[PDB]
Subunit: 115 residues, 4 copies
C-alpha cells in the first residue's frame, strides 16, 4: 500500500470517519486525471487506494472533502476541501502517508514518506 | 483589502518573500476562472488582490507557488504545494486573511474572517 | 514591542479576544520567574509586554490561559493548554511574534523572528 | 496502553526518532510531579509510558524535547520543547494519543482521545 491517507478531527479529538478523498494525477497534457478515491474508516484511515505498479512517478493531487464532513457533524466550516499537490516517486518508489489535521477554519497536510 | 494572503516559512521563522500567489473563482461549468494574482512582500503579505466591488459571493481557490522563493534563497524544498479552496461572501462581505505556513513536507493554512 | 503574542480561534476563524497571557523567564535555580502578562485585544494580539531594555537573552515561557475567553462567549473547550518555551535574543535582539492557533483538542504555535 | 505519544518531522517527512518525552502530573499542592518518560522509537511512537491503574484522573503535562532533536540533525530550532497541558480521565478512563507535528519554528500538538 504505497499511498495512504489519515485524517484527524481537532474539534472532537478523534479520527475523522467517513471523509471522502479524491486523488488525481497530472497527465502529459497538464490536466488532472482521476487516479483514486475512497472514504476513511473508523480509524480515520484510508487504505487500498492504489498499487505499487500503478503508482508511478508523477504529480499527484489529494483532495479531502472536509466541508461535507463538518456539515454532517453540525459545524459550518471555512474550506470546501483540504488539498495538497506533490511529486511522488521521482527518486524511486516510496510509501506515502498524507496525514491531515482538521479544524473548521484551519488544516494541515503532512507527507510522511518511507522506504 | 477584503482578501489578504500571508505566507510564512516554518523552517526559518520568517515571512516567505516574493512567493507567487494565484487566485481563481469557480465558474458555472466547474472551471476555475482566473481572478487575481501577485507576489508576497517583505512582510510575507500580499495586499490589493481585489476590491469589495469585484469580490462577490463565490467559490475561490488560492494557490501558493513557492519555486522562485526557494531557488533564490537557495533553500530546500517544500514538496507540498498549497491550494486553499473556500466559499467567500455567502453571508455578506467579510475581510478574509488566508495564511499559509510552509515546511518541506507539510503545510498548514488558517482563515481569519472579520466583520 | 520586541515580543508580540497573537491568539486565533480555529473553530470560529476569529481572533481570540481577552485571552490571558503570562510570560516567564528562567532563573538560575531552574525556576520560572514572572516576566510579563496581559490580555489579548480585539485583534487577538497583545502588544507592550516588554521593552528592548528588559527583554534580554534568556529562556522564556508563554502560557496562554483561555478559560475566561471561552466562558464569556459560551463556547466549548479547548482542553489543550498551550505553553511555548524558547530562548530569545541569544544572537542579538530580534522582534518575536508568537502565534497560537486554538482548537478544542489541538493547538499550533508558530514563531516569526525578524531583524 | 492509555497514554501514547507520536511525533512527526515536517522537514524530513518522517517519523521523529529518539525524541525524549517527559510527562508530569499536577500534585495536590499544585506542583508538577514527574509521572513518566521515554523516547520515541523508529516509528516515531512512544508506548508503555503508564498503566490504566496508575493513569488516574488529573492534570498532565507532556513535554517533547524538540530542541535536542533538531540540533542532532543539524538544525537550529526556535523552541526548547513542545509542551501541552491537559486534563485526563475526568469523564472516566480514556486512551490518549498526543500526536505532535514538528517544524523548526512551529509545532502542533493534538490529543486523540478514544474509548
Amino acid at each position: 500500500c504505497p499511498l495512504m491517507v489519515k485524517v484527524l478531527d481537532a474539534v472532537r479529538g478523534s479520527p475523522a470517519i467517513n471523509v471522502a478523498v479524491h486523488v488525481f494525477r497530472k497527465a502529459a497534457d497538464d490536466t488532472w486525471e482521476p487516479f483514486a478515491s475512497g472514504k476513511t474508516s473508523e480509524s480515520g484511515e484510508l487504505h487500498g487506494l492504489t498499487t505499487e505498479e500503478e503508482f508511478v512517478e508523477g504529480i499527484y493531487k489529494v483532495e479531502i472533502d472536509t466541508k461535507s464532513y463538518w456539515k454532517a457533524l453540525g459545524i459550518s466550516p471555512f474550506h470546501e476541501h483540504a488539498e495538497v499537490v506533490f511529486t511522488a516517486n521521482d527518486s524511486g518508489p516510496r510509501r506515502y502517508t498524507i496525514a491531515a489535521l482538521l479544524s473548521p477554519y484551519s488544516y494541515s497536510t503532512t507527507a510522511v514518506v518511507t522506504n
